[PDB]
């Protein structure tokens, strides 16, 4: 058993993994639809690698070190110039109300922590702790009335912009301090798409 | 021949040698609720099932099996929260001329799939796999069955031992929970090697489950 | 047989007694399609390198009355597998009397030039060849079914280890 | 169940109780040659033989049996002189419903007769008596077979024990000798009581020989 | 022997040396070919200085402190403007599958470590350790069925760009903690081109 | 005159004074496999080669030379992995009136070049350089030959000493390896100063290699 570490649960799970690509737009007054802000309920059940790894086991606890990689681009060739934008990356915790408009009350709310990421700087980062009501995240639950990790909402803070600027935000979830319980037969790659 | 007893119940075990404790943790009370260990902790022997050649498997949920079962079933309705470990004796009494094997798999959170409560909860009669009815070699969820031997389990190979014993501790995300809603454990008995027997012998051997709820404790009684 | 219950059982009849083995299982644990899908193989599909030993276990799921002998051979790396019972016997083997012990374990050992082995080799079968032959055709008493089944299990030994994770799951 | 081992070989004995040492002398090295006890001393299991009702007997010579058998067969060709004791396990695995008996006779200098080398030396397959083929109740030489029980021997009576074990020391006029030419020992298995069995049981039980050459030592290697 | 250090094996080998120039393009929707991403199997057998130095010796172990110097430029005179790009510099370890498309599954894979380098910042850097299956890299191996250090893949993360922006990434391999074994006659400079 | 012995082999050395150990490391067993030091560790004397005036050089690989050589060659085929150090005595017996010199170079990983297995592996007869056949003053790879004296080496200058001895340890990236595939060592004998001799003397002196595999150990035997 030569230093079995590499297959330890930490080494196994704790890896940066893109879980979503959230696209937002600049509040240009031309015809911009409700794409002015993006919303995404934190969930592993869309990414297959992390899902398949977690579903080896029945229960789990883990902190969550989300990292945000924002990249923008002018939409049309009317580039000209446009000042460095700022992005509000709000992490709506569990059970809290999610935004609905660009400038809903939720964006100013004290509760919801928020990053103000300036473009062209180092990637933003928060560390959500274990936000479970249970003492462990249940991946399989034979019972009656899924777990909540929160929502991530993203918008451009700037307002009166002449040129449209699309921007994609890659969320890089790295589960941290994982503990897991009750191994299981791994589901097959076949049935995830 | 070890003759076991729990109050007003008694069982005739061969001997408790091949006894698997699931996850090496014996059932324990919580280290706050009442503990009706008076008479609810007894052997509830379910209605036997007949293993023919064509059988694909059987399954029960726990404690949904013991829902109409006397005091445990009562406790588990008139209290709001409860937790219970179990001792599942699967006795499968056959002659020396029958042959086959059974994989007895205790499954945490055995969410099956072919959805509704009455459908996912067969009670005391249990359900059966099929080649609704989940897929046998999948346990509903698209699993390869060999991998199933990660679960707390035991083989009943008719040439050798004819009975298994699984001692299940309380497995749940929570310390205590509503039993009427949520089945912690799940038992699936699948025939690994199919039944076969000599020419004019008994063509369907029986299988009997005996479930002693260990270290049960409930709160709060309405 | 695949993707059913039948894909795990090896049938032992008393049909024309040929010398070719009951089964021959190559131990390329991730490359061999049979061992690829075991939990061993599942974890090894998540890693570039591995080392250590593998315990196999064959379980007779026949009549309590049945008797006979199966020879469980293990050809080491490089050796082409045995084709006849004698060749297998002369190498490493275990004669397994069905009557007496109903199971048979065998811990294949760790042998490799490198400290580890890749899980996707240069398409080159090496190492194991766990063969099982009849030494004696199976004896049964009165009207007992001459067709038995044996199951096969596999597990990494304690010494086993992996390294250099390699996620490949995708859609 | 005693599981015996010799290097890269393993055997499953019932238990070594009914084990006959021939002439009460355990195999010993000579009290001068090399002793390849490294890997040549292992279990060589010959090709099984089927005992039907009509069988009259079987025989092997030693070490002519182990002539194509790996290292012992190699040693015994590339050396000029050798000597070896043996351990012959005759396992005869049958059900409880077969009946019969086998006399297993280890014979010193088992000169048979109905003459030439290939004819008197069947190798690993062995030869068979007949009512060429020597006379069963004579062992070729005009003997009454009951008297055969002077030889180092053992009965395999299927109702009781189903396997014999004969530990043979090196018997020869010389201290060491050429094995390629001269077979010291000779094994003859004759069915004393004929095979019989219940109606539709296995109609031919197998017999298996396992030969561990004990205390072998050879000289001089070419 | 006045402080022979300067000719020690560390001092000899451990020097920043450009091993490749990887060129990538911006995902402009005009006619951009499969130059959208660049791939390069880490190998000293192309650079002559480092090759010739290593081939003094038969075997070796060394960590590898790769450094990346990214430099971009507008292709045509339609410059106008374009927002600061981000580059994904993925280090595919040995035995892992290499990317084939711009957005292959490999780019999101947890296994493959990846840098997200923003333009106009300090040069990116990783330190690959010794990734040999053997206990030493063999430069000469008389035998039958070369060693693997990995692959470096590079892409622009931005998507809807109006102007094309070429970009070259200089990889500056500096072997670190070198040990070597069994000196040899040095090959001549003559036969490398 | 030192008369050396290894089992069933014997050699007549002048005396082991000018004996070069390669890289100052004596062959050692690994500080897990079997060690057949019984008889595989003996002197294998290859077929002599004739050094005429026109000779450019000779070469052998190790252990490809000792592939058909008895027990070592056997061990090295029926095992999968092995490792072995060596002792190469190059005796070159000439009169007092011949003159010349030989550089004997033990070469780790002696990849030659003018490609295929049979071509890069001459066996016991060895190959020969040429001014395929690699370039003598290059050793195939485009080397200047003087630089070759970095390799573990020894000169046989006929005026003085007429024999060299090279004690080679196991050099490889791995602790153990397949010998059938991969030749760790490589011996090249090139005539530094060409042969010349008095008028009607022996016009071609012989060269003889004696290879004792030291500290060999193998795994796993098929």
Residue numbers in the entry:
A (entry chain 1), E (entry chain 1): 69 to 213, 234 to 281
B (entry chain 2), D (entry chain 2), F (entry chain 2): 13 to 43, 52 to 134, 143 to 159, 174 to 264
C (entry chain 3): 61 to 231
The article reads:
Poliovirus is a small (~30nm) non-enveloped, positive sense, single-stranded RNA virus. The icosahedral capsid of the virus, which is made of four proteins, namely VP1, VP2, VP3, and VP4, encloses the viral genome. For enteroviruses such as poliovirus, genome delivery involves a program of conformational changes that include expansion of the particle and externalization of two normally internal peptides, VP4 and the VP1 N-terminus, which then insert into the cell membrane, triggering endocytosis and the creation of pores that facilitate the transfer of the viral RNA genome across the endosomal membrane. Structurally, receptor binding results in an icosahedral expansion of the capsid by 4%, yielding a 135S, or A- particle.
One method involved the binding of virus by the poliovirus receptor at the cell surface at 37°C in a natural infection; the second involved incubation of virus with the soluble ectodomain of the receptor at 37°C; and the third involved heating 160S particles at 50°C in the presence of divalent cations that stabilize the meta-stable 135S intermediate. Receptor-triggered and heat-triggered 135S structures (designated "r135" and "h135", respectively) were solved at 3.2 Å resolution (after density-based masking and sharpening). As expected, the capsids of both r135 and h135 were expanded by 4%, with holes at the 2-fold axes, were full of RNA, and failed to show well-ordered native-like VP4 pentamers lying flat on the inner surface of the capsid. The r135 and h135 structures were qualitatively similar. Surprisingly, both r135 and h135 maps lacked a visible extension of the VP1 N-terminus through the quasi-3-fold hole, which was supposed to be the structural hallmark of these particles. In both cases, residue 69 was the first ordered residue of VP1; residues 43–53 of the bottom loop of VP2 (which supports the VP1 N-terminus) were disordered; and the quasi-3-fold hole was partially blocked by the GH loop of VP3. Thus in the r135 and h135 structures, where the 135S particles had been prepared by protocols that were believed to result in both expansion and externalization of the VP1 N-terminus, icosahedrally averaged maps showed that the VP3 GH loop was in a conformation that blocked the hole at the quasi-3-fold axes and there was no detectable density for the VP1 N-terminus. As in native virus, the center of the cup (near the 5-fold axis) contacts the VP3 beta tube; but further from the 5-fold axis, unlike native virus, the density is seen to curve away from the capsid (as if it were peeling off of the inner surface of the capsid). Moreover, an unmistakable gradual curving of the VP4 layer away from the capsid, peeling off of the inner surface, was seen in the r135 and h135 structures that is remarkably similar in appearance to the density that has been ascribed to RNA in previous studies with other enteroviruses.
